[PDB]
Amino acid sequence: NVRLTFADIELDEETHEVWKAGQPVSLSPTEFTLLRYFVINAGTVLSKPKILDHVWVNVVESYVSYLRRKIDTGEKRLLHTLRGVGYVLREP
Amino acid sequence: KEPRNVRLTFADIELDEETHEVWKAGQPVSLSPTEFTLLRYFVINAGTVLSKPKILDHVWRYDFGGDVNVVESYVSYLRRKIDTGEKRLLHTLRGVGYVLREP
Amino acid sequence: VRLTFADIELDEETHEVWKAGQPVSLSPTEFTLLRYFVINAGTVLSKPKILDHVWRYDFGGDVNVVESYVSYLRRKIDTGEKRLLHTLRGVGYVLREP
Amino acid sequence: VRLTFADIELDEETHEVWKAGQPVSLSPTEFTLLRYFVINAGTVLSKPKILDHVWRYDFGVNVVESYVSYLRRKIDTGEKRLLHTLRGVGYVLREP
Amino acid sequence: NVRLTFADIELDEETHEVWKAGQPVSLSPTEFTLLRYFVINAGTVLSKPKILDHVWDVNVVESYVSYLRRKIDTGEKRLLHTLRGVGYVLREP
Amino acid sequence: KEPRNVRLTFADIELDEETHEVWKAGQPVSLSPTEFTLLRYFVINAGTVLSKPKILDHVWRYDFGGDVNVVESYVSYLRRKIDTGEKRLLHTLRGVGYVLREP
Ligand SMILES: [Cl-]
Ligand SMILES: [Cl-]
Numbered sequence: 001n002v003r004l005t006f007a008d009i010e011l012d013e014e015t016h017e018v019w020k021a022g023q024p025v026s027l028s029p030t031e032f033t034l035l036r037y038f039v040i041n042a043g044t045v046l047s048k049p050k051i052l053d054h055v056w057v058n059v060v061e062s063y064v065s066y067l068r069r070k071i072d073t074g075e076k077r078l079l080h081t082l083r084g085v086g087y088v089l090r091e092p
Numbered sequence: 093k094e095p096r097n098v099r100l101t102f103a104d105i106e107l108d109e110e111t112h113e114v115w116k117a118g119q120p121v122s123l124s125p126t127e128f129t130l131l132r133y134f135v136i137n138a139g140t141v142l143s144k145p146k147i148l149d150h151v152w153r154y155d156f157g158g159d160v161n162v163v164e165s166y167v168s169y170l171r172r173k174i175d176t177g178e179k180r181l182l183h184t185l186r187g188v189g190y191v192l193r194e195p
Numbered sequence: 196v197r198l199t200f201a202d203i204e205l206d207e208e209t210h211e212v213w214k215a216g217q218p219v220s221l222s223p224t225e226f227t228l229l230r231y232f233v234i235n236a237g238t239v240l241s242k243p244k245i246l247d248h249v250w251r252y253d254f255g256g257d258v259n260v261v262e263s264y265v266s267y268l269r270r271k272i273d274t275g276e277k278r279l280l281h282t283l284r285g286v287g288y289v290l291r292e293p
Numbered sequence: 294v295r296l297t298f299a300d301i302e303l304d305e306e307t308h309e310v311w312k313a314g315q316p317v318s319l320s321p322t323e324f325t326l327l328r329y330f331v332i333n334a335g336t337v338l339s340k341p342k343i344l345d346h347v348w349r350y351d352f353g354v355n356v357v358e359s360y361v362s363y364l365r366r367k368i369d370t371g372e373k374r375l376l377h378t379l380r381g382v383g384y385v386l387r388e389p
Numbered sequence: 390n391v392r393l394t395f396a397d398i399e400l401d402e403e404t405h406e407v408w409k410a411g412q413p414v415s416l417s418p419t420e421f422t423l424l425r426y427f428v429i430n431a432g433t434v435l436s437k438p439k440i441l442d443h444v445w446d447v448n449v450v451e452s453y454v455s456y457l458r459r460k461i462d463t464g465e466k467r468l469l470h471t472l473r474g475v476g477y478v479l480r481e482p
Numbered sequence: 483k484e485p486r487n488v489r490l491t492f493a494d495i496e497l498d499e500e501t502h503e504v505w506k507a508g509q510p511v512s513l514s515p516t517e518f519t520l521l522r523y524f525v526i527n528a529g530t531v532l533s534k535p536k537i538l539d540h541v542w543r544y545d546f547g548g549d550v551n552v553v554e555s556y557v558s559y560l561r562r563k564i565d566t567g568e569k570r571l572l573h574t575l576r577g578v579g580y581v582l583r584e585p
């Protein structure tokens with residue numbers, strides 16, 4: 001998917017460029033892989049071991065946190081936690 | 093191999109389809125791919141009033157998130173970047189849609 | 196590849212531009228307009244002539260694109276104590292030294 | 294091309310480095326030293342070993358101590374430190 | 390002379406890079422050509438018509454000598470000098 | 483095409499002969515070509531005391547400006563950029579010259 005998108009998040013797999021609300025965002029390779037995994041699986045609740053398996057437990061929490069800081073600090077939050085099940089990318 | 097023109101223009105907006113560079117009134121504007129696609133769609137269709145349904149259909153793949161609320165958001169982002177000056181080019185036709193035209 | 200008039204410098208290859216020794220960023224249309232003035236330095240160029248050269252004769256609308264782009268270009272490039280880009284009312288514009 | 298340990302990421306092709314998702318600029322020697330640690334994560338590496346790996350045995354191990362310091366100041370800035378000194382033994386890259 | 394120098398002025402004819410006292414200096418193509426002309430002719434007094442001939446209005450020479458001075462010659466020891474009625478010269482005090 | 487090492491090292495100074503990049507204690511340093519040539523000359527000759535005459539002869543072409551005062555200037559410019567740490571590597575031997583060495 002040349003351009004890949006969900007809501008107002010945009011990724012370019014060839015350049016590894018990312019935008020949120022039209023503004024560029026600099027991600028490390030792991031952060032990009034992680035965001036891509038959420039976006040391709042938008043709306044699906046993803047456990048930590050599942051994320052760990054596909055992107056590579058505490059490292060998952062760390063990188064979800066890093067990613068949230070770069071891409072999810074606006075009024076409407078797209079990356080959500082639901083305890084004991086995992087994380088989900090979805091509109092409120 | 094390079095005898096080429098890949099620029100589009102409307103009024104004082106200039107776009108390069110290859111680089112996705114954009115200029116407004118001679119000044120560079122940084123657009124995301126979605127903002128670029130949206131601007132291109134307005135430019136190619138300048139003077140036409142475009143409902144939120146058509147834009148959605150054209151600016152993203154059908155398999156995207158199909159909500160006229162995303163369109164509204166992106167039109168907002170685009171306007172902030174490209175349509176800041178005294179004469180606005182990007183107008184809202186309440187209950188009908190948006191149009192790129194001279195006022 | 197080097198085109199100059201007074202202290203305006205254009206690189207015809209890279210489309211780099213300098214004024215008074217300092218780099219100036221121009222859009223593609225601004226560069227084309229400036230080049231047209233420079234290769235015609237001292238020659239008066241009417242608005243219809245510039246319009247049909249840089250754009251085309253039917254590139255119409257409400258406000259005139261030639262006037263607009265001359266303004267933009269002057270704000271970028273014609274900042275010296277001595278102006279080089281002059282308006283000749285009813286006739287056009289000319290690039291020349293005062 | 295991609296080498297990672299915890300939240301340190303190296304691109305073996307471009308020599309780009311990230312820590313906690315943020316780019317970090319390293320000198321060629323700092324990059325070699327960091328790569329050596331990452332490919333040997335969890336393995337204790339003595340100063341003479343690092344010296345002869347990154348430089349050579351007859352450099353003449355203060356340079357190892359210096360470059361570990363430089364690298365820690367660039368890369369080992371998280372709340373949890375990853376680059377650990379083992380007195381009389383060497384250094385190890387590991388999660389606390 | 391891929392690398393060209395006088396005193397603490399340095400020019401790189403391939404990259405058109407310039408340094409003064411070890412610090413980079415950005416010059417336009419005309420400024421570079423003009424500085425190069427002074428450097429190759431270090432110590433020689435150069436009239437305005439001579440400079441005009443080789444680098445390209447008499448006022449354009451004055452203008453560019455001024456621009457060049459501002460970028461490369463504002464330290465304690467000045468290297469680019471005016472000899473009124475004769476021209477300009479690159480030399481140490 | 484690129485099985486290559488073009489780097490020189492002394493202590494915590496690193497130079498790349500191709501790109502003319504330099505690092506001191508891991509941090510980049512920008513040198514002019516003359517400063518680079520001078521550093522290279524000290525590095526290749528580390529521990530040797532070098533008079534102003536030798537440096538002049540080696541760091542510029544003979545057909546340059548042959549003044550030991552230029553050497554002094556450039557050694558000053560180089561020290562300011564590469565040798566500002568607590569532990570100085572570039573030393574002056576009054577009446578004899580300069581040397582790159584640990585103190
Ligand atoms: Cl899409
Ligand atoms: Cl070595």
Ligand SMILES: [Cl-]
Binds near residue numbers: 486
């Ligand atoms: Cl090697």
Ligand SMILES: [Cl-]
Binds near residue numbers: 392393542546
């Ligand atoms: Cl030389």
Ligand SMILES: [K+]
Binds near residue numbers: 248249250251
């Ligand atoms: K035309």
Ligand SMILES: [K+]
Binds near residue numbers: 345346347348349
């Ligand atoms: K070795």
Ligand SMILES: [K+]
Binds near residue numbers: 487489490491
């Ligand atoms: K080497």
